[PDB]
Amino acid sequence: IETVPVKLKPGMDGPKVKQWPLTEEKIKALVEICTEMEKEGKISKIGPENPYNTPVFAIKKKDSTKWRKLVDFRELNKRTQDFWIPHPAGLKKKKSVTVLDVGDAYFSVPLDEDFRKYTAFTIPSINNETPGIRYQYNVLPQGWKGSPAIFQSSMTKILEPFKKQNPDIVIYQYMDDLYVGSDLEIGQHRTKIEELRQHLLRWGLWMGYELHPDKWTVQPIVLPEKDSWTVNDIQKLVGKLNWASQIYPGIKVRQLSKLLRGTKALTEVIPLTEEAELELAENREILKEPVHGVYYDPSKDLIAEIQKQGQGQWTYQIYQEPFKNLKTGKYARAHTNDVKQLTEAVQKITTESIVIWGKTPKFKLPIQKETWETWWTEYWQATWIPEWEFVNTPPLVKLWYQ
Amino acid sequence: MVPISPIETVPVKLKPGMDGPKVKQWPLTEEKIKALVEICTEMEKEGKISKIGPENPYNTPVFAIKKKSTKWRKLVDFRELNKRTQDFWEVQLGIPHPAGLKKKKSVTVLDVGDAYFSVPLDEDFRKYTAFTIPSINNETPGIRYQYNVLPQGWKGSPAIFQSSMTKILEPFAAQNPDIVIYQYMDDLYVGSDLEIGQHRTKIEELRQHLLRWGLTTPDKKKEPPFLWMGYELHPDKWTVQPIVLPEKDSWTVNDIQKLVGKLNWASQIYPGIKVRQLSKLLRGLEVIPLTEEAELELAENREILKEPVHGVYYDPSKDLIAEIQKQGQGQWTYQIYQEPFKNLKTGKYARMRGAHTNDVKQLTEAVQKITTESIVIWGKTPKFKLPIQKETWETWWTEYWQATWIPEWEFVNTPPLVKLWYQLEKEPIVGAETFYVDGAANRETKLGKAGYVTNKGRQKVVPLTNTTNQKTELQAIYLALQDSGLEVNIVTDSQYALGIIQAQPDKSESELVNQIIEQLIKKEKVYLAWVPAHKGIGGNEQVDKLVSA
Ligand SMILES: N#Cc1ccc(Nc2ncc(Cc3c(F)cccc3F)o2)cc1Cl
After folding, report:
1. Burial of B489: CB neighbours in 10 Å, binned 0-12, 13-18, 19+
2. Residue A257 and residue B537: Cβ atoms within 8 Å?
3. Which of A215, B121, B449, B493 is the most buried (most CB within 10 A)?
4. Which segments carry the region annotation RT 'primer grip' (chain A)?
5. Are A105 and A200 found together in one domain?
6. What are phi and psi of B9, to 5 degrees?
7. One domain for residues A167 and A284
8. How many Å lie between the alpha carbon of B415 and the closest alpha carbon of chain A?
9. Is B364 in contact with B406 (CB distance < 8 Å)?
10. Checking DSSP bridges between strand B356-357 and strand B383-386, what pairing results, if any?
11. ∠ CA A164-A166-A171 to the nearest 5 degrees?
12. Cβ A98 vs Cβ A209: under 8 Å
């Protein structure tokens, strides 16, 4: 009922980010939505004296048909002072985890009157034939990094009853998301989730996203098992082994290259010497153990790389230092839209990253900027948005992960 | 007296930590001062300014300019006060494009140079607007004035004027959805599809509604066509203002840079306009000789410009179509239309500056640009007609290492067709000779060698001058391609060359890449394999020795 004082970083102005083109249907959804939010006092029109701006658009969450307003607060969040939730290392270990959109709770808390001007956004018009409808926020806005940090006191209270009643459940909050982990059976699971919606309606949001840990975290590197090796097979193996030697100490290829002794046809079969096989086996051994000195450090950036492998398969690795992977994965679930798949891959990787480390990674996307910037908002369904850059040079490494 | 509602003020502030202006009132002639005093007395009479006492420490210089007329004009120079005023939210940042307008049966334009003065200025901010008419012979105190209304030339007049008109007009537009309203400078545009009787009625209702705020508009005393932002707007069609390509038997850098502006502007409706060579003549205000390639490209601009072309307005009930053609030299041209041959607009796309490229990638980028342009103008993606076969597109995107996509589209068979010029093998080729290639160069002497060693005992090493490791690694591949049959396996340790060929260029800045491309086009099958250097991989080792000597 009384606002929390918030201010940007020292010497940083509010965001001045141009609105990007919206389709007619997204414009219409936003007009209807913003009209009601104004009627409900969550937002208010503003005049030309406010110079700041943040982009806005419209998504559809997964398995619903109603448009949702998404403000891309990425710039405001960078400029929003740091606010002083810890990360529960047990969340990633629960048999299951459901994800709940609680961003609607925020609209009940006023916003520091002096900060409001910074939540400025424009609904554009087609062909700019009418002035953009401009608004700012009066309440905590979805997607702002402050909104969880501020509501954090009110949310602890709303939960204490349920937490004290189920001391085995883990509960974590990132952006407008509540992550509720369990170790029960889905049916018992679903109900307790239904339970947890009642506190919020009682204190007052029906959607639930499923999610279980993987198995390996860092998928092992594996070598072929063959009864006959062509020269090509051995050339690919030595290449893969040499790559892996930047990650793992004692990888040796002397005895395998030895086999490639001369100028043979790529398809000719080489029987492996006894040395050769031994060397291949010691490398196999090595690859089973973990990497050495591989630690997460919450002060540094997480980095996610994605490779398109074809046939709806996508590989990815999350690291901080090169060759020190904290997680590696594969994804194969849009059978004709490369960009929808990539966009779903980015969302899935970002979700895993929130559950493991409580923050989002910086993506290196195997796509041209202009394609990605002209199509990702059509397939986006999360209420957060990570950072990204663009790989323009084909990695030679895509092979080592297939 | 009919009561008039006030125009609520817009809070203005100066930039943080900055303060008003304090600049010297220039000395004037007695003839000029006399003229200022009369004008400023009439503005004060009307309400636009007010006399201030001497506490005000701010000053903006003021001038008198002779109307090219025996009458003088006053000119307050706020360049200084502007630097110190806050930023505003501009809305005119995006201007509409005529292709996005709808056809109107009737269209009027009111003029609003009277209301702009019914727009008060934020009280707390007037003080910053002080100016001084110097006195005759400097023997009295200068007269001191400040503004009570948005001043011509102030940083915040456009925004605040627009925003105030908008809010006035809003209820009237909402209660008349059968018309459109749009405001720019002192000009209000009202169009509709009503019969002229009903249309002139509503223009009357509009003037009445503007009277509620005491805003007086011209009497029935224009109509189509309008000149606006360099367009000619008619009720059922639009085109640019005329495009006259000057004749010149001697062209200079200022003349060539202005010939690409005109061609660029005209390229939004005049189909197939090109600007490559002329734009190139500007690479990196000197008379430059037009190449023979620029005089045949200019002679093609003058014949496309010979007569006028018109564009149609947008009919939301019909699909949008966009059609692209390959012009050559990384140039693309497109048209957007709903009914055959009646374009709403046209345009062109140019290759991004890179070292290597291919047609499919360029087509894709042009599609993306047309796509974003269409979201801006019509709120939707057009359907595409593209000179590329469905099978070609499918081969491209399923094998390309990046993610790529183009929206709903159909093949249109209008040459030249975009195609894939070669495809590398996924597996080594049985029965094809295996070429182990290698190349090396001495960083100091720029001397190196390139060559290959094959499984049939074929061999070659060529000595080279003025080369680099990178150039010898490509030359080696080039040699193996030159000396092999229609099917061939090639082993290289060059990550450099791999990165280039796996990009699948069809054209290059490097003539060495282009020769390789030309060889690849002639092969039936090529499998390109990579091995790490210096690991003693057979053949790679052999040929490394031969080329590193
Ligand atoms: N002759 C003529 C003529 C023919 C058709 C139209 N149609 C139209 N649809 C939307 C608008 C508003 C508008 C202008 F009226 C003017 C500039 C920008 C703008 F957004 O106008 C307008 C005119 Cl002026």
Report:
1. buried
2. yes
3. B493
4. 205-212
5. yes
6. -80, 160
7. no
8. 26
9. yes
10. unpaired
11. 90
12. yes
- Laid out side by side, the sheet with A43-45 consists of A43-45, A133-137, A121-123
* A262 neighbourhood in chain B, CB within 8 Å: 538-539, 542
Give SS3 for B255: helix
Give the angle subtended at the CA of A41 by the CAs of A35 and A46, to the nearest 5°.
70
Cβ neighbours of A316 (radius 10 Å): 22
Q: Which of residues 172-201 of A touch B (CB under 8 A)?
A: none
Q: Does B135 touch chain A (CB under 8 A)?
A: no
Residue whose pair of structure tokens reads 């480390």 in the numeric block: A357
Q: Is B377 in the pocket of ligand 1 (CB under 6 A)?
A: no
If you search the block for the tokens 């895509």, which residue do you land on? Answer: A398
**Residue of chain A whose Cα is closest to the Cα of B433:** A265
Kindly state the tokens that stand for B513: 């890449």
H helix intervals, B175-316: 196-211, 253-266, 276-280, 292-304
CA–CA gap between residue B228 and residue B391 (Å, rounded): 46
| Domain match, A374 and A331 both | yes
Task: List A91's β-bridge partners, or say none.
Answer: none
C-alpha B229/C-alpha B458 separation (Å) is 69
Q: Which residue has the tokens 């992960």?
A: A401
The resolution in Å comes to 2.3
- Cα of B341 vs centre of ligand 1, distance in Å, is 22
- Do A167 and A301 lie in one domain? The reply is no
Indicate the SS3 state at residue A66: coil
Q: To 10 degrees, the CA torsion angle through A245, A247, A250, A254? A: -10
If one counts the domains in chain A, the total is 4
Beta strands in A277-365 (DSSP E): 303-310, 313-319, 325-331, 362-365
As a CATH number, domain B434-548 is 3.30.420.10
Q: Is A285 helix (H, G, I), strand (E, B) or coil?
A: helix
At A139, list the tokens: 């309440």
* Experimental approach: X-ray
Whether B382 and B367 have beta carbons less than 8 Å apart is answered as: no
Tokens representing residue A58 in the block: 């419209």
* B161: helix, strand or coil: helix
Q: State the DSSP code for A128.
A: G
- The 8-class DSSP code of residue A92 comes to G
Q: Is residue A53 domain-shared with residue A106, that is, in the same domain?
A: no
Q: What residue type is assigned to position B275 of the chain?
A: V
Token output for A110: 């006023």
Strands B226-228, B187-192: pairing is unpaired
Domain membership of residue A200 as a residue range: 90-114+156-210
Tell me, yes or no, whether A177 and A284 share the same domain.
Answer: no
- Determine contact, residues B234/B225, Cβ cutoff 8 Å: yes
A53–B499 C-beta distance less than 8 A:
no
Of B10, B364, B538, nearest to A260 by CB-CB distance is B538
Same domain (yes/no): A31, A150: yes
Pick from B348, B414, B422, B349: which is nearest to B386 by CA?
A: B414
The last residue of one of the domains, among A246, A276, A296, is A296
User: How far is residue B302 CA from its own chain's centroid?
Assistant: 23
| Residue closest to A375 by CA, chosen among B399, B350, B503, B402 | B402
Q: Is there a single domain that holds both residue A40 and residue A149?
A: yes
